Symmetry: D2
Subunit: 360 residues, 4 copies
C-alpha cells in the first residue's frame, strides 16, 4: 500500500535537530547523559532535562521527559523558514495524518512547532523557531576526552522499508546507501537532507519503534574513550555493540544503552552526500562487511530490541509485524548465510555468526 | 615437577628481540608481513625473509623461514653483553636442557648465539651480537597509516602456569599481571625484563605452543587502520579478535592471523614497569573486563588455537595436556560464567559469552 | 563601485568542486601533489594532471595545467541542476561580466560549463555535468598516513572586502565569520554554500590573487604526518605556517607551498553552518588568537604572497591595490598591535609579532 | 683538570627521574595551573604544599609545589633501585666533595630515607628508594582528561660546559642518546638516560645552574593539541612559549608552556626505545634547522635564554656561571648565525635570521 505523493509542496527540511525521549527515572538518565556522556545542560527542572552537543547553537539536541513508559515522544527536524511549518502541516494533512500545532512549542526553547503522526506511525516534529544559546565549539576548557560534538541522525524500525523509503524521498530525503538481497527484499535504507550519509534511516523490523539516536565525535579516539570510561565505571554491560567501522556509511561507531534501554550510537567520519546525484551504494544483506567492515558479528539484540514510540496523545503506538525476511534470520539465524568474499566458501558462515559465535 | 633454581647466574636479559617462524609459502607470507602489515625488509632470498619494525636498529625482529611445517622455530632474547651468552649456556646446562652454541649465529645478522630446548619445551635463543641497520624511526617518507614501530612481546601456551612462572622469575622476569580464580588456579601470567608490561607471557593450555608475537604502534588509530585495510583487501576473516582495550596491560589491541595461522597481536600504550616494587595486578578469571575492558567476548579460537613449536632438530615438540581448569570453560562455555560487577547478577553471563552470543 | 543585485535569479551552487592551476614544470608538480601529498590521479597526459581526493566521486578536485605563467585559471563550483548553468549565464550577463559557455567542458571530466571573469576579476566556473569515477572512500589499501579526503574551499585576495561580500551574498553565499576593527574596516570574511564554514573566503589585499586552495583530512594526526613527511624529505622549507588551530573556523590547519608557490592549506574539523540563521562570528583584527588560536605569529609572507589569476584568454589579471588598512601592518608591522586578552597589556604585542 | 673525577665508590643504581620540587610564590595560582589547567592528580595538599602525580604513577608524587619567597627548583629527585643505593649515593657524592644532607624520614611527604646533594654542577639532586604507594590511576578513564599527563618523563638542566657535565652523568650511569655539536668541536646540548627512553635528564649549554624544564608525557599527539586548545579557551595562549612541534632530537611530539612563576613545562610523547647498551648515539649539527623542530619552525630566543633558578640545600639561590663556549642562539639565529634545511644548500637556509 504505497503512500501517495501529495500535491502540496514538501517542507524544506534542514536536518535532524533533536529527540524527545520519555524516561522513567530522571536522575538516573541525567547521570547517563551528563555524567557519563558529557552532554551540556541547556535547562532542567524536576520533570525534564534539556541537553545539547558541544557545537550546537539551537536550544537543545535532546529532551529527557519524565514519564511512566519509556519511549520516543518526538523526533524533530528543523525546517528552513517559518513558512515551512505551514507547508509541513498541509503536506501531512493531505497524507491523511493526525497533526498538532502549537504556536509556542511543545518543549522549552522551541517556538511554533508542528507534531504529526506520520504514515509509518512515527511522531515527527517540524519547527523553525528556537532559542539560540552559547555555541560551545571552542570551549576547550569544557571539552571532554569523549566529547559529543553534534547530533547526527535517527534510526527508525519499520516493517516495510520500500514503503517508507518512497514517502521519505517525496519529503525530500535522498537514499545514500541501502541493504538488499537478490530476491527483491530491502532490509535497510539511509537517507539525508543535510549532506552527511543520513538524517534518518529505516531498519526493517516490527514497528514503529525507534532504533537509535546518533551523536558524533571529532575523532575515533573520542569513541574509544567512551568505551574506556564505561569500563572504568564498571558499566561495560551497557556497551551493546562496537566499537567498529561501518560498511554502510564508512563511519566509526559504537552502540550503547541508556537506563531505559534507549539505544544511542556514537558515530564519526562519514562522507559528503550533498550532490543531488551522489552515488547510492547497495550492499548485499549476506556481505559480512556491510554493518561491521571488519566482519565482527552483529549481536542479536541489535536486530530485535528498539524503543517504543508514542502517538500525539502520549499513548504507545501498536506494533505492526514485519512479514518481509528478517536480516537476523538470513545472516546469523539457523538458515543464515554470510560471506567475506562474494562467491568464496572460505570465510563464509552458515547458520551462525562470524568469528566463532552462534545466537545465544 | 618444580624447575630448580640453578647455582649458575642467570644471563642478564634486555628484552625480546626477534622470532623465527617457519612458514609454508614464502611469497604468501611476504605479502602478509610486508604488503599488508608494512614491515621493513632487512634481507631476503628464496629461503627466508628478515623483517624489522620502524624503530628497530638491530638486524631484524622477525625471520620467516620456509619449511614443511609451520611452527615457531626460535623466540630470541637479546642479552646485555657477550659474556651473558656464556652465562645462558651454563644456566641451561645446569637445568639439564639441551643446548646448541653457534659462534657465527643461526640466522643472518646475529653473531654468537645459544639455542636451547627450555624446561617448558620452548626453543629460546640468547644472543648479544647483532648487525646494526638504518634505524627508520624518522623515515616518515616510508611511514604507513598502520606502521608497526617495535616488537613488544611473545605469548606462550603452557599447561602449568605456576611451574613456568617460577622458572621465568629465576631468569629475572618479574610478574606484572596475572589471572587467577578464588580456588587458587592460575590461568595466565605476564612478565617483563624491559620496563613494559611484558616481554613474554604464559597462557594456560596444552603446550608447548606459541600463542602470538606482538608488535606495537604509536597510536590507537594505527591499529584501526590495520582493520580498515584488511576490510578493503577483503581479508576481514583474518581478523581474529578485536580491536579492543585490554584489562590486563591496559593496552589497545588487535589479533590477526597470518597465512599459516600464526597469530600476530598489534598493541599500544601499556604502562611503565621498570621500578622493582612495581605493583602486581591480579584479576579474577570470571571478571569480564579482564581481557577485553569493554566486555567484548573472547572468541573461542583465541583459547584453543596456537602454533606448533620446534625442537632444535626442527621437529615438532609433543604437546602435554593441561589438567588445571580451562579459562574458556569456566568463563564462556556451557558451564562458565563471567561478571561485569563482582557480586552483581545484572551484567553477568551464565553458560554463554558476553553481549548475547554463545559458542559456535 | 557597489555591485548591483541582478533581477535574474542566482544559480543554486552546491559547493566548491575543483580548481585549475597553471604550473610551469608538470613533473615537479606531479611529485608534490601525488608523491608528497598522495592525491589520486583520475587522468594524466603530457600537458595536464587531473587529481582527486580520497572521498570524491566527481572526476577531479584539481587540474594542473602546464603553461608559461603559474596562476589560477579557474575556480569551479558545482551547481544543483543543468538549468542552473543557464541561470549562472543570465546572472553574470546582467552583472555585465564577460562569460564563455562550453557544452563539452573546458577540462576533461566536466560537461556543459560556464566560465566568467567575475566582478572581482576572478575566473569562476559553474557546471553540473561531470564524469563520475570510483569513489575511493573505503580503499584503505591505498590510504596514506597524510590522506587528503575532500576539497574544502578556496580563499581569494581582493582589495575591498565589503564590496565582494555583498556580491557573494547575492549569489547565495552566507557569511559565517569575519575579521573587522573598531574603525569600520573589514579585513576578511568566510562564506558558505555547502554547510561547512566556507566554500570561499575573501582576504583583504591587492587583488585579484588566489590565496590558497584547501583540502581536508579526517584527523589532526594526518596533518602532523604531512609535516613529518616533509621533514623526512628535507623540504620543511616548503612548510609556510603551522600546523595550528584556527580561531576563525575552529579548524586544525597547515599551510604549505607547491613548486610554483601556490599555497595549499590542509584543514580539518570545522563545524556545521547549514542553518540559515547560523550565528555569524566577528573577530577583532587585533585579537592574537583569531588566526592561530594558540597565538603563534602569522609570518608576513602569508599576508603578502598569493598566486596570480588569469582572465578568460589566459592572461594575468592586473592587480588593484588595496587602500583600506593592511592586516599585516595593523597587527605585526612597525606600528602594529595585538592582544591575548582584550584590555590587558600583559600578553600584548607592540610593533612586532607574538612569541618573541 | 676542571674535570669531575670518577669516584672509586660505586655509583648508586638510578632507575629514573621521579619527581621535582618547585618553589612557587602563589600556591593558589600554581594549583590552578597544575590541577585545573593541566589536570595533575592530588596526592596530598595543605596551606604550604601541593603534591601531584601523573595518571599512570604509583609512587606518591611526581611534582611537589612548595610555597616560598623566590620561585626556583628546590630538588630534582631520582629513584634508586634499592635502599642501599641511598647509602651508595651518599658515599659517592661525599667522595666528590659535594655538600650532602641525609634525612632518614625524607624531605617531603611520601618519601622515606632520602639524600639531597649540591651536585658538582650546582644542582640540588635527591636520591631515594622508599616512597608511599598510592592508587595507580592508569585505568581510571572516568578521571581521564582530553589533555591527560600520563608520566613524568625528564628534566633538562642549563649548564655552561656540556662535556664536563656529560662525563659526570656518564660516570653516574647515564648514557648519551643524542647530542648537538658543530664541526669545530663545540657541544651545545646532550640527552642521557637511565630508564629506556631518550632521556631522564639532559644538558643545555648556557648560563647555569638553571633548570630549563620539567617534562610530562601524554599518550598521543592529540592530547598535546588539546592543552594548546584549552589554553586558547582560557585566554592564556601567551603562556604557550613554543610549539606544538615534532622534535628532531628524540623524535617526540612536544609543547613548551610557562607556569605562573615562569617555570617551563614540556609536554612530550612518542620517543623511542634506548634500553640496549649499544643504542646508536645520534649527533646533529647545530646549524641543521630540523634538529630542534623537525619541521623547521624557529626556536624563540626565550627558549635559549630563560630558565629557572635553582636552590642550594639552605634554600638560597645558587650563583650562575656564564657559558664561555659558543652560544647555540648566536650561531643559529643571531646576527652572525645561520641554519640550513639541506646541508650545503643556500635555498632554504637562513643567515642572521631565524626561519620561516
Ligand atoms: O626541540 C628541541 O629543542 C630539542 C629537544 C628534544 C627533546 C626534548 O625533550 C627537548 O626539551 C628539546
Ligand atoms: Ca537470495
Ligand atoms: Cl550497522
Ligand atoms: Cl586478552
Ligand atoms: Cl588564518
Ligand atoms: Fe546509525
Ligand atoms: Fe599479547
Ligand atoms: Fe583557508
Ligand atoms: Fe625536554
Amino acid at each position: 500500500n504505497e503512500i501517495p505523493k501529495p500535491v502540496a509542496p514538501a517542507p524544506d527540511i534542514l536536518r535532524c535537530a533533536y529527540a524527545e525521549l520519555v524516561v522513567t527515572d530522571l536522575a538516573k538518565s541525567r547521570n547517563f547523559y551528563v555524567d557519563v556522556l558529557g552532554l551540556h545542560v541547556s535547562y532542567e527542572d524536576e520533570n525534564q532535562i534539556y541537553l545539547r552537543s558541544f557545537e550546537e547553537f539551537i536550544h537543545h539536541n535532546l529532551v529527557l521527559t519524565k514519564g511512566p513508559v519509556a519511549a520516543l515522544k518526538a523526533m524533530a527536524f528543523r525546517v528552513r523558514t517559518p513558512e515551512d511549518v505551514d507547508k509541513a502541516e498541509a503536506y501531512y494533512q493531505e497524507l491523511g495524518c493526525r497533526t498538532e500545532r502549537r504556536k509556542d512549542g511543545f518543549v522549552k526553547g522551541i517556538g511554533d512547532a508542528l507534531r504529526v503522526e506520520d504514515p509509518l506511525g512515527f511522531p515527527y516534529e517540524f519547527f523553525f523557531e528556537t532559542t539560540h544559546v552559547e555555541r560551545l565549539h571552542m570551549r576547550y576548557d569544557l571539552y571532554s576526552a569523549g566529547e559529543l560534538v553534534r547530533l547526527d541522525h535517527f534510526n527508525q524500525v519499520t516493517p516495510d522499508v520500500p514503503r517508507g523509503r518512497k514517502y521519505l524521498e517525496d519529503l525530500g530525503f535522498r537514499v545514500t546507501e541501502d541493504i538488499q538481497d537478490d530476491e527483491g527484499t530491502t532490509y535497510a535504507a539511509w537517507m539525508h537532507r543535510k549532506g552527511t550519509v543520513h538524517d534518518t534511516a529505516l531498519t526493517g523490523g516490527n514497528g514503529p519503534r525507534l532504533h537509535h539516536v546518533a551523536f558524533s565525535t571529532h575523532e575515533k579516539h573520542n569513541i574509544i574513550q567512551i568505551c574506556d570510561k564505561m569500563g572504568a565505571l564498571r558499566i561495560s554491560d551497557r556497551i551493546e555493540r562496537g566499537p567498529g567501522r561501518h560498511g554502510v556509511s564508512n563511519a566509526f561507531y559504537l552502540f550503547i544503552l541508556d537506563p531505559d534501554n534507549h539505544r544511542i550510537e556514537i558515530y564519526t567520519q562519514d562522507y559528503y552526500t550533498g550532490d543531488p546525484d551522489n552515488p547510492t551504494i547497495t550492499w548485499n544483506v549476506h556481505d559480512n562487511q556491510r554493518r561491521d567492515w571488519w566482519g565482527n558479528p552483529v549481536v542479536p539484540s541489535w536486530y530485535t530490541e528498539a524503543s517504543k514510540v508514542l502517538d500525539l496523545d502520549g499513548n504507545v503506538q501498536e506494533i505492526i509485524e514485519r512479514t518481509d525476511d528478517s536480516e537476523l534470520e538470513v545472516t546469523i539465524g539457523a538458515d543464515g548465510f554470510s560471506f567475506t568474499r562474494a562467491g568464496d566458501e572460505d570465510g563464509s558462515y552458515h547458520g551462525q555468526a562470524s568469528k566463532g559465535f552462534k545466537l545465544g
